[model samples]
Target: SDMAGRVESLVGPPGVAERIRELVKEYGKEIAALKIVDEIIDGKFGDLGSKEKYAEQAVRTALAILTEGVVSAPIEGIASVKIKRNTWSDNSEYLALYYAGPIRSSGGTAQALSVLVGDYVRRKLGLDRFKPSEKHIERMVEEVDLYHRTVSRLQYHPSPEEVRLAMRNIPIEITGEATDEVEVSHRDIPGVETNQLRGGAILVLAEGVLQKAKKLVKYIDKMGIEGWEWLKEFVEAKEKGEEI
Candidate 1:
């Protein structure tokens, strides 16, 4: 209860106080906060009605747990969460996380974990995976490189094929507002609202996910989160320096 009390003293998402106390009592401090994140995504906080609003709260809680409520990344780094209509013929809907520059404060591990949490919430909500059109894929591929060349350097500059692989398989759309004025050659692409470079999303995807693939795999394994085993194979190939 003391740990929960301390967390409540820190600025965090609403209702986290009771959640911390409950989870810490049940699961103990080390893993209790993580369980609360699961509970939050599971709709324990209440019926948030819209998927976007629900996902937004889930991500913020997860970030708060990972950072122990000390950093502003949970609120500031995450710009918004929304469900984007599928552009494919199926016309389905999927989850999307729009990140801001402040997400960098969570560091690479937490940033990557945030995506995993998005996948978890999507599953709980019975949402389908984000299916990117070829244009959507190409736009992201180009935007990653373009962002690095013009805006700032990426920690790991993934190849076009690597970017394509990740974009195709990732369950949610990691997107954001146009950070830089630099525009993409693949403009007017459906499902991707912005024509300009999404620097924060790029950092989370390329640098955070692709670059931190190994560490994220450890988290996935420890958390026993399903659907992320594919990333392990990608990490293996990446470590071998083999084209994947």
Candidate 2:
């Protein structure tokens, strides 16, 4: 804690400096992430110059912590952050998280938690939620299926019902550039850039978000993060028997 020249220690944010262990012990990793984000946003860790960058830095740092600072998922995996206008939502701005293929190495739980982290940052910055239209939502559902069939076999498969609900309820744009050469039938949807299967994003939704949905609900509760009740409701239906 006394040195400044060490490359390893300097790799992550100073928000975790000198106090991370106690905080993590008290609140666990998920809620500790929120505390770290609050510190970063408050300029306690030295401001990155904007609310947007604060949000991005907070998300990446929290993700790195979740992965135990061992993988490229926190660095190269999340390609970029954009504050874009949502014309469909009356020209409001939303946080768009562009992911890359390297995200796959982060594993499903960490991937799912990244979305939660993004949402926490989104609300912190007063950004509006991502509004996916019916057409665009359907386009993703088909692409998920098409990607599973044509490009690669996925470990978890979700129904269109579950997929649509997850897509609608999640506040951030969990998307990335297409990772597969195979094209999708549901082409040219607005806000989505590819006709080909978005391999990494698909994994985030299916293998990560949907497959690990139950575990995520627990974190959402433990972390005191809201806006994810739909996830709990849906999980209860599947596990206990609506027809949950």
Candidate 3:
């Protein structure tokens, strides 16, 4: 308990932190996160000021497990979660999880599950699903597609349609701070704007979510988190592009 106890004392509550480790060890990362989310939401980790804060813990802790506690992705990769509205389609609240460049090292699967974990927490807290508008799609599509020659090339760059499919289906907003020094045509959307790569956001959407959909869907089936009905279409579109 030397190392585990020491770390837990600093960032985790007594005994429970060890319990989470045991759960992860036995059940595996995705399942462990799903299980832990329930307890955290139910107040096992003590009360957070709001359900929003609980969801933040939900994704952060899940990323920690998904990465096996080796990287800073857990703390810095997914640094922010905000409740925002679609603003046009019934104006319902949605969870906007902010990622930073640190998330790039978490592996595509873990990054994808970071969003998965957030959506699960979002629903448990009774928030409405994110409704992405057309302009929203334009920004994501343009930036990721526009990234091919400029900035740095993403390992798994998504096709325009793939970006559309994944963004529309996802329950959480994939957004983050600007991670590069570039300008874009679209400059209206908040958090995501002109001349900004928003590197973490772009990577999470293209490389993490769309490109890694193959791996992400399995966890969805296993974890018992509802939503993501568009996964089949997303997978089909991706296979068409890779054609491997």
lDDT of each: 0.78, 0.77, 0.75
Q: Residue by residue across 81-198, what tens digits does model 2's lDDT show? A: 7777767657777887878988887788878888888888888888999888777788878978888788778788888877788888889988888887886776777788788777
**TM-score, model 3 to reference:** 0.87
Best by lDDT: 1
Which pairs, if any, clash in model 1? none
Q: Candidate 3 on 4-38: residue-level lDDT in tens?
A: 33335433544557777687679866687677777
TM-score of each: 0.89, 0.89, 0.87
- Residue 47 error, candidate 1, Å: 2.9
Q: Is candidate 1 or candidate 3 better by lDDT?
A: 1
Query: Is 1 or 2 the stronger prediction by TM-score?
Result: 2
Ranking by TM-score: 2, 1, 3
What 10-residue stretch in candidate 2 is worst by lDDT? 1-10
Best by TM-score: 2
Model 2 TM-score, all chains together: 0.89
| Candidate 1: tens digits of C-alpha lDDT, residues 182-214 | 867988877777888888899899878888899
Candidate 1 least-lDDT 10 residues: 3-12
What is the Cα-based lDDT of residue 138 in candidate 1? 88
What's every prediction's RMSD, in angstroms? Answer: 2.5, 3.0, 3.0
